[PDB]
Amino acid sequence: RKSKAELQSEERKRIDELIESGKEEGMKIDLIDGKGRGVIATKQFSRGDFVVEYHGDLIEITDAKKREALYAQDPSTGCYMYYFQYLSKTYCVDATRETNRLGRLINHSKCGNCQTKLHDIDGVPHLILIASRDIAAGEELLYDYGDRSKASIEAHPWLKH
Amino acid sequence: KSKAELQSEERKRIDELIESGKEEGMKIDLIDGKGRGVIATKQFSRGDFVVEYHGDLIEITDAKKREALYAQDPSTGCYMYYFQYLSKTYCVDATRETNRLGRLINHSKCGNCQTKLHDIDGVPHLILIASRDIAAGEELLYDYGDRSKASIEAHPWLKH
Amino acid sequence: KSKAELQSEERKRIDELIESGKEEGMKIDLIDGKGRGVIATKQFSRGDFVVEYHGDLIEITDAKKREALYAQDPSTGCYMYYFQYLSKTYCVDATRETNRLGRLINHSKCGNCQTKLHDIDGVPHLILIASRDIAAGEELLYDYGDRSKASIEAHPWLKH
Amino acid sequence: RKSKAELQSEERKRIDELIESGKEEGMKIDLIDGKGRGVIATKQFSRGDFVVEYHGDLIEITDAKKREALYAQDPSTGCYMYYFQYLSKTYCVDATRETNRLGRLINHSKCGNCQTKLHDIDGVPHLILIASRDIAAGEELLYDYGDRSKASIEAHPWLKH
Amino acid sequence: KRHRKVLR
Amino acid sequence: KRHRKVLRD
Amino acid sequence: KRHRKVLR
Amino acid sequence: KRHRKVLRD
Ligand SMILES: Nc1ncnc2c1ncn2[C@@H]1O[C@H](CSCC[C@H](N)C(=O)O)[C@@H](O)[C@H]1O
Ligand SMILES: Nc1ncnc2c1ncn2[C@@H]1O[C@H](CSCC[C@H](N)C(=O)O)[C@@H](O)[C@H]1O
Ligand SMILES: Nc1ncnc2c1ncn2[C@@H]1O[C@H](CSCC[C@H](N)C(=O)O)[C@@H](O)[C@H]1O
Ligand SMILES: Nc1ncnc2c1ncn2[C@@H]1O[C@H](CSCC[C@H](N)C(=O)O)[C@@H](O)[C@H]1O
């Protein structure tokens, strides 16, 4: 039929379009016991499928650390900052501000069903969540927040699992 | 006194007030644009116990059940106060009309009370503590904490 | 018809029921233990317009002034109806004796009318709509909503 | 000094003995221009003094409504029905029938010299007129009839006074 | 056209 | 004491 | 249409 | 204190 190259190209274009449109289908917000709000799948996702972008304010590490030192003065702020490496620098998606975007509401597990990856579009990095296994309708979406800090775990013991 | 001694004395005052349900130094008033509110009738000092957020303590299954029912009746107000305790979601549902005053206190992000979780031998309570000296005659206010887009769209007073 | 057409037709009917003020299907009667009240003289179906709560529309600060003056004369009677509109508190002060019937409708927590806000060109009106089918001869009743400990002590019928 | 209990019992004794005797001393009938009959004080009364009972047929609401509808058929009847609430029910002292009693003959004024009060003797309610101030001999006795309804005040404009 | 007397 | 009539919400 | 109260 | 969400290579 088509070559691997053609299939990969057409797949990447579909992902680019989902990122650009901000379409966030197949998900609903629910209250999750012990976790606050979370996001539930309303349809099946297959392993490797695009689930959602982790969408918010893209900023650089120095700016992020400054914002965070201010947030730390107000214990009510909550933790919505997602730091990552892109090429030879470090960036952050700061999703502290409440929006209708769902990525920022997804909770943590070390044995979840989503994996975050970098998807750049013409030199602009995007953090996207991909299904790491098939996901059933009704499942809570979960991924590994990746914070191994002793101090973080002491204050947020749910990070342990 | 040591920190521990001061903490024990505070815990004891708070436990006594939770027990008695005494709600002195407050009254209900109509506040323009807010419905009822609660106003101080005496000065409160920073750190003082003000009131318990008192209602039906329930877990998440019942809270969700009740939410779904309340949502079907537009005349029903919003009195459900959610919190985390021992890795579970709890809710003080103060929807039923009672004589208790915590349920009537209005919202501000720059108010004069702060809600704390206070545990008595494994039973959680939500209590309001004065975050600054509170003048006689001024409205009691605390941060409701719902910052969600879905809520602020419908209730813009949440933004301030 | 489109939704827009159905909505505008509905709005116009309610606007016109308000503006004409005919107050059909009701009569004053003496009601045991309640003073005067209002009885249905026709069937009302659930959802039907019953009557406006008609009187003098004022803002909250003037309402508070009038309350204090009325309280000077225990014979006055309580005909003031507080409500919220566009982030402000208003009151329909129906103290003055007119030919309008809404002001004469008595209280129940198991009544047959529900009060709703209906605005016309930025002017708010309070209207009563049937909350169930009402048979001819039934007394019209709605929940006055005043739950204050003090009001209930002075007016024990508020409890039911 | 007299105790509060003595004062209350002595107060009730004055009132209840005047109610029961019904002699209605210190008053006379006269003709008052534009009012019909009225009642004139022939002695001084002091503030708080019992003046006279509003005396007639004590009836409950169903009979009152029945009687109203009958009286309404005859313009000569006049308006002598005095409604009040007692123990969560509506009662009426219907003084329509002509008798020698004077309470039924007292005319209306919003700023009169008597106030009607509900007074219970051994579980039987009575409507009594009490002096709201010192009353001089020669005064017409007057109290507020209490009917402020638009229909009444437009048909009986003296109710506005 | 009747009025009443009413205790207030 | 006076009571009121009030529409909640 | 409803908001919550939420401990933060 | 706070936690973070962190991705690395
Ligand atoms: N596995 C878990 N257990 C308990 N809380 C969790 C969790 N994973 C995420 N959270 C909560 O979610 C926060 C990250 S943002 C995720 C959305 C959040 N639950 C909300 O309602 O706004 C964490 O700081 C913590 O409050
Ligand atoms: N800052 C504010 N501005 C406007 N309304 C407010 C407010 N804070 C609280 N409220 C109102 O109070 C409700 C929460 S319950 C607080 C008591 C309520 N005012 C009452 O009379 O029953 C809210 O849903 C909203 O109706
Ligand atoms: N359920 C009830 N029981 C007893 N009195 C009631 C009542 N509901 C209303 N009322 C009376 O009606 C007043 C409100 S205005 C309603 C009209 C009034 N009954 C009148 O004749 O003018 C109340 O203050 C009280 O006097
Ligand atoms: N202030 C007033 N001015 C004119 N008529 C009055 C009045 N107060 C009472 N009345 C008259 O008295 C009636 C109530 S019964 C009072 C006794 C009556 N005047 C009589 O002669 O039998 C009223 O309906 C009215 O006819």
CB crowding C111-132: b at 16 or more within 10 Å, else e: bbbbbbebeeeeebbbbbbbbe
**For B47-81, b where at least 16 C-beta lie within 10 A, e where not — what string?**
ebbbbbbbbbbbebeebbebbeebeeeeeebbbbb
Distance CA D89, CA C153 (A): 18
The Cα B50–Cα B44 span in angstroms is 8
- Amino acid found at B45: S
How far apart are alpha carbons B95 and B70 in whole angstroms? Answer: 9
DSSP state of C133: -
β-strand pairing of C80-85 with C88-93: antiparallel
**Tokens 């225990």 belong to residue:** C74
Q: From chain G, pick out residues whose CB is under 8 angstroms from the CB of A75.
A: 8
> Sheet holding D124-131: strands in order across?
D50-53, D124-131, D114-121
> Which of H1, H3, H4, H6 has most ligand 1 atoms within 8 Å of its beta carbon, as the pocket-test mutant?
H3
CA of D160 to the centre of ligand 3 (A): 22
Q: Does residue D80 line the site of ligand 4, with CB under 6 A?
A: yes
Is the beta carbon of A117 within 6 A of some atom in ligand 1?
A: no
- Dist. CA D153–CA C97, nearest whole Å: 10
Residue of B70, B146, B149 best to disrupt the G interface, most CBs of G under 10 A: B146
Half-sphere exposure of residue B110: CA atoms within 13 angstroms, side-chain side: 2
- DSSP assignment of B78-126, as one string? --EEEEEETTEEEEEE--S--S-SGGG-EE-TT-SEEEEEEEETTEEEE
Closest CA to C141 of C89, C106, C101, C109: C106
CA gap D146, D116 in Å, rounded: 10
D128 close to C (CB below 8 A): no
DSSP designation for D104: G
Nearest to D83 among E1, E2, E6 (CB): E6
Query: How far is the alpha carbon of B38 from chain G, nearest alpha carbon, in Å?
Result: 17
Cβ density class D107-136: b for 16+ within 10 Å, e for less: bbbeebbbbbeebeeeeebbbbbbbbeebe
Answer yes or no: is D112 a known binding residue. no
Q: Which of B30, B75, B157 sits opposite C82 (nearest CB)?
A: B30
Candidates C87, A58, C81; CA nearest to B159 is: C87
Cβ atoms of residues B59 and B88 within 8 Å = yes
Residue C12 neighbours by CB distance under 10 Å = 10
The DSSP secondary structure of C71-126, one letter per residue, reads: TT-TTS---EEEEEETTEEEEEE--S--S-SGGG-EE-TT-SEEEEEEEETTEEEE
CA angle A133, A134, A136 (to 5 degrees): 135
Instruction: Name the DSSP class of C140.
Output: P
Sheet with D89-94: list strands edge to edge: D57-60, D89-94, D81-86, E5-6
Q: Is the CB of C104 under 6 A from ligand 3?
A: yes
Q: Which of B37, B30, B51 is nearest to B125 (CA)?
A: B51
Q: Where are the beta strands (DSSP E) in chain D?
A: 27-32, 36-41, 50-53, 57-60, 81-86, 89-94, 107-108, 114-121, 124-131, 142-143
Residue recorded with tokens 């208003």: C90
Q: How far is CA C67 from CA B139, C91, D150, in A?
A: 21, 11, 22
- Is-contact B78 B154, C-beta < 8 A? no
Contacts of F8 in chain B (CB under 8 A): 35, 75, 77
Contact E5 D159 (CB under 8 A): no
CA-based nearest residue in chain B for residue C147: B97
User: In which order are the strands placed within the sheet that holds C80-85?
Assistant: C56-59, C88-93, C80-85, F5-6
> CB neighbours of A154 closer than 8 A, spacing ≥ 6?
none
Q: Do D147 and E2 touch, CB atoms closer than 8 A?
A: no
Give the bridge partners for A89, in sequence order.
Answer: A86
Instruction: Phi first, then psi: give them for residue A13, nearest 5 degrees.
Output: -60, -35
Strand partners, C63: none
Handedness of CA C13, C17, C23, C24 (dihedral sign): negative
Angle at A124 between CA A121 and CA A128, to 5 degrees: 70
Written as six digits, the tokens of A56 are 């918010």
d(CA C58, CA C126): 13
In this structure, are strands A107-108 and A142-143 parallel, antiparallel, or unpaired?
parallel
Burial (0-12, 13-18, 19+ Cβ within 10 Å), A140 = middle
In whole angstroms, what is the distance from residue A40 CA to residue A142 CA?
9
Q: How far apart are CA A78 and CA A68, in angstroms?
A: 11
Give the helix, strand, coil percentages of chain E, each rounded to 5: 0, 25, 75
Counts of helices then strands in chain D (DSSP H, E)? 3, 10
Query: Both ends of chain G: CA-CA distance in Å?
Result: 22
| Residue B37 labeled ligand binder | no
Question: Residues B4-25, buried b or exposed e (16+ Cβ, 10 A)?
Answer: eeeeeeeeeebeebbeeeebeb
Instruction: Report residue D20 CA to chain centroid gap.
Output: 15
Residue A131 near residue A15, CB atoms below 8 Å: no
Distances (CA, A) of B129 to A150, B44, B45, D105: 31, 10, 9, 65
User: Quick check: D83 contacting C, CB < 8 Å?
Assistant: yes
Query: How many Å separate Cα A161 from the centre of its chain?
Result: 18
Q: Are C26 and C100 in contact (CB under 8 A)?
A: no
For chain B, give every domain's residue range: 1-160
Q: Distance (Å, rounded) from C-alpha A114 to C-alpha A136?
A: 12
Q: What is the strand order of the sheet B123-130 is part of?
A: B49-53, B123-130, B113-120
Both tokens assigned to A24:
């966030």
Residue C45 exposed, middle or buried by CB count within 10 Å (0-12, 13-18, 19+):
exposed
Phi-psi domain of D137 (left: phi exceeds 0; alpha: psi -120 through 50; beta: other): beta
Experimental structure resolution, Å: 1.5
**D41: Cβ contacts below 8 Å, ≥ 6 apart:** D26, D27, D135, D136, D137, D138, D139, D140, D141
Give A1's Cβ-side CA count (13 Å radius).
3
Closest CA–CA distance from residue C153 to any residue of chain D (Å): 14
Measured between alpha carbons, how far is B66 from B62 in angstroms, rounded to an integer? 6
Residue with tokens 């008609």: C54
All residues at 6 or more sequence positions from A98 whose CB lies less than 8 Å from its CB, including other chains: B147, B148, B149, B152
The shortest C-alpha distance from C30 to chain B (Å) reads 30
| DSSP secondary structure letters along A6-26 | HHHHHHHHHHHHHHHHT---S
- Residue C9 to residues B2, B114, C5, C15, C22: CA-CA distances in angstroms? 73, 49, 6, 10, 19
Residues of chain C with C-beta less than 8 angstroms from the C-beta of F3:
78, 144, 146, 148, 151, 154-155, 158
B1-160 adopts what CATH topology? Beta-clip-like (2.170.270)
| CB atoms C98 and D150 under 8 Å | yes
Q: What is the whole-number distance in angstroms between the Cα of residue C34 and the centre of ligand 3? A: 5
Q: How many CB pairs under 8 A join A and H?
A: 55
| Contacts (Cβ under 8 Å, ≥6 apart) of C95 | C55, C66, C70, C76, C77, C79, C80
d(CA D148, CA C87): 35
Rg of chain H over Cα atoms, rounded to whole angstroms, equals 8
Helical ranges in D72-116 per DSSP H: none
Query: Bridge-partner residues for D19, per DSSP?
Result: none
**A100 shares contact with chain B (CB less than 8 Å):** yes
| Ligand 1 site, residue A107, Cβ cutoff 6 A | yes
Phi-psi region of B41 (alpha: psi -120 to 50; beta: other; left: phi over 0): alpha
Report the C-alpha gap between D21 and D8 in whole angstroms: 20
CA of D20 to the centre of ligand 2 (A): 57
Rounded Cα distance, C40 and A24, in Å: 53
**Cα Rg for chain G, rounded, in angstroms?**
7
Question: In this structure, is the dihedral angle defined by the CA atoms of residues C33, C36, C40 and C44, taken in order, positive or negative?
Answer: negative
Domain A1-161, second-level architecture? Beta Complex (2.170)
Enumerate residues 6+ apart whose C-beta is below 8 A from A135. A41, A44, A45, A51, A113, A114, A141
DSSP A55-105: -SEEEEHHHHHHHHHHHTT-TTS---EEEEEETTEEEEEE--S--S-SGGG
Cβ partners under 8 Å of residue A63, min gap 6: A92
Ligand index nearest the alpha carbon of residue C29: 3
| Alpha carbons C154 and C157: distance in angstroms, whole number | 9
- Count the Cβ atoms, other than its own, within 10 Å of residue D78: 14
Choose among A79, A127, A146: nearest Cβ to H2: A79
Strands D50-53 and D124-131 turn out to be: antiparallel
Residue with tokens 């579009």: A121
* Residue B138 identity (one-letter amino acid): E
Residue D34, Cβ density class (10 Å: 0-12 exposed, 13-18 middle, ≥19 buried): exposed
Q: Answer yes or no: are the C-beta atoms of D131 and D117 closer than 8 Å.
A: no
CA gap A109, A125 in Å, rounded:
24
For ligand 4, say whether the CB of D101 is within 6 Å of any of its atoms: no
